[PDB]
Design a protein around this motif. Structure first.
Motif, mmCIF file in Angstrom:
data_model
loop_
_atom_site.group_PDB
_atom_site.id
_atom_site.type_symbol
_atom_site.label_atom_id
_atom_site.label_comp_id
_atom_site.label_asym_id
_atom_site.label_seq_id
_atom_site.Cartn_x
_atom_site.Cartn_y
_atom_site.Cartn_z
ATOM 1 N N UNK A 126 10.696 -50.747 52.118
ATOM 2 C CA UNK A 126 9.321 -50.402 51.733
ATOM 3 C C UNK A 126 9.149 -50.402 50.212
ATOM 4 N N UNK A 127 10.089 -49.745 49.540
ATOM 5 C CA UNK A 127 10.061 -49.583 48.096
ATOM 6 C C UNK A 127 10.316 -50.904 47.368
ATOM 7 N N UNK A 128 11.227 -51.706 47.887
ATOM 8 C CA UNK A 128 11.476 -53.061 47.382
ATOM 9 C C UNK A 128 10.268 -54.049 47.564
ATOM 10 N N UNK A 129 9.528 -53.929 48.670
ATOM 11 C CA UNK A 129 8.226 -54.637 48.768
ATOM 12 C C UNK A 129 7.284 -54.254 47.579
ATOM 13 N N UNK A 130 7.103 -52.951 47.354
ATOM 14 C CA UNK A 130 6.229 -52.423 46.275
ATOM 15 C C UNK A 130 6.700 -52.761 44.844
ATOM 16 N N UNK A 131 8.004 -52.967 44.698
ATOM 17 C CA UNK A 131 8.619 -53.382 43.438
ATOM 18 C C UNK A 131 8.238 -54.790 42.963
#
Length: 228
Positions: free
Chosen positions: A221-226
Motif C-alpha cells: 500500500x505504502x509503496x504504491x503511494x510512494x
C-alpha cells in the motif's frame, strides 16, 4: 518528464491482502500489478477487482502454456527474477527466449536483471547487468520495447538512493545508445530490492527510477503511494 510509474508485487494472508488492495483509493496515475503462482492465479483473479491493478503470471516458457494464460485473461508476466538465474539455472539466453516468446504471445513483460555480491565487489556491476539486457535485446525488435519493463534487482539491506540511481542510469544510457533515445525515454525501470514505505518514497525521487518490484505484503500500500 517521467513515464507512467508501475507498482508491482511479486508472490513467492492472500485473501486479507486482496481485501486491503481492493479498499485502497489510489489518487494518481500508476499501473499496479500482482504477480502470482499458477496454483494461486485463479483465486487472485476472482478476488482482486481494483481496476488500477492487473494480474501477472510468473516464469512461463512454453508456448501452449502462454496461450492458455492469455485465454484465461492474464496479460502480464514476470521473467528472469534473481532465483531463476542463481538457483534454477536460467541463463541470460533462456531468459531472453522466454521474454521474446511472451511478447509474441501478446504479453506485457517485466524482465529482471541484477548482479550478485561478488560481481559488485569486484567492480563488475556494469558488465554483468548490461550483458543480461543485451541478451534480451538480441531477440526483440524496436517496436517490442513498448511491451517491456525492466526491473533492476541488487541481488546483494537497501541500496542507498545514489547506488540505485547509478545502476538505473547505467541501464538507460545503454538503452538510449543501443536501441534509441525515444525508447529510453518511455522505458519503465523499476527498483527490485529492499523496499519499505519510507525508503520507497526517497528512492522514487531519483531521476531514473520509475517504480518498484516488491513483495506481496501489507506494506505494498505504502509503496504504491510512494510513486509520486
Amino acid at each position: 518528464s517521467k513515464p507512467q510509474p508501475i507498482a508491482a508485487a511479486n508472490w513467492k494472508s492472500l485473501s486479507e491482502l486482496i481485501d486491503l488492495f481492493n479498499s485502497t483509493s489510489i489518487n494518481h496515475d500508476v499501473q499496479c500489478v500482482v504477480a502470482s503462482t499458477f496454483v494461486h492465479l485463479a483465486m487472485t483473479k476472482e478476488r482482486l477487482s481494483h481496476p488500477k491493478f492487473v494480474i501477472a503470471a510468473q516464469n512461463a516458457g512454453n508456448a501452449d502454456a502462454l496461450a492458455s494464460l492469455k485465454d484465461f485473461g492474464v496479460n502480464w508476466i514476470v521473467l528472469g527474477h534473481s532465483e531463476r538465474r542463481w538457483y534454477y539455472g536460467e541463463t541470460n539466453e533462456i531468459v531472453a527466449d522466454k521474454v521474446a516468446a511472451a511478447v509474441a504471445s501478446g504479453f506485457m513483460v517485466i524482465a529482471c536483471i541484477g548482479e550478485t555480491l561478488q560481481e559488485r565487489e569486484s567492480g563488475r556491476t556494469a558488465v554483468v547487468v548490461l550483458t543480461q539486457i543485451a541478451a534480451i535485446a538480441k531477440k526483440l525488435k524496436k517496436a517490442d520495447w513498448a511491451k517491456v519493463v525492466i526491473a533492476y534487482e541488487p541481488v546483494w539491506k537497501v541500496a542507498t538512493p545514489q547506488q540505485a540511481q547509478e545502476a538505473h542510469a547505467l541501464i538507460r544510457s545503454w538503452v538510449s545508445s543501443k536501441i534509441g533515445a525515444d525508447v529510453a525515454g518511455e522505458l519503465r525501470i523499476l527498483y527490485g530490492g529492499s523496499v519499505n514505505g519510507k525508503n520507497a518514497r526517497t528512492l522514487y525521487q531519483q531521476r531514473d527510477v520509475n517504480g518498484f518490484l516488491a513483495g506481496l505484503k501489507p506494506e505494498f500500500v505504502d509503496i504504491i503511494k510512494a510513486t509520486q
